[PDB]
Design a protein around this ligand. Structure first.
Ligand code: ZN
Lengths: 4, 96
């Protein structure tokens, strides 16, 4: 998962 | 950012039932129950989710990924995370  | 205090960034999403409701039209593989239990709620923008407590956001989820693990990986200072998973769990995610 990628943070934003 | 993120919020590492004991006060939730979004009190309205502090309840599990409130967070799970946001996943009514969830189409992604990553489990909604697991996401909600991990403190996340859907923004209704793709697979973007945010933790009601630290306000940390996560998107671009992988099929088998574990919400708690990603929560600890990116937002180790989250107090809801601490309360639910413990300090050892977090520290181990950032092992030497
Ligand atoms: Zn959090």
């Amino acid at each position: 998962a990628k943070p934003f | 950012f993120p919020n590492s205090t004991n006060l939730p960034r979004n009190p309205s999403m502090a309840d599990y039932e409130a967070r799970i409701f946001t996943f009514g039209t969830w189409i992604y593989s990553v489990n909604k129950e697991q996401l909600a239990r991990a403190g996340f709620y859907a923004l209704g923008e793709g697979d973007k989710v945010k933790c009601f407590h630290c306000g940390g956001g996560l998107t671009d989820w992988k099929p088998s990924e574990d919400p708690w693990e990603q929560h600890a990986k990116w937002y180790p200072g989250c107090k809801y995370l601490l309360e639910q998973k413990g300090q050892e769990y977090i520290n181990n995610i950032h092992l030497t």
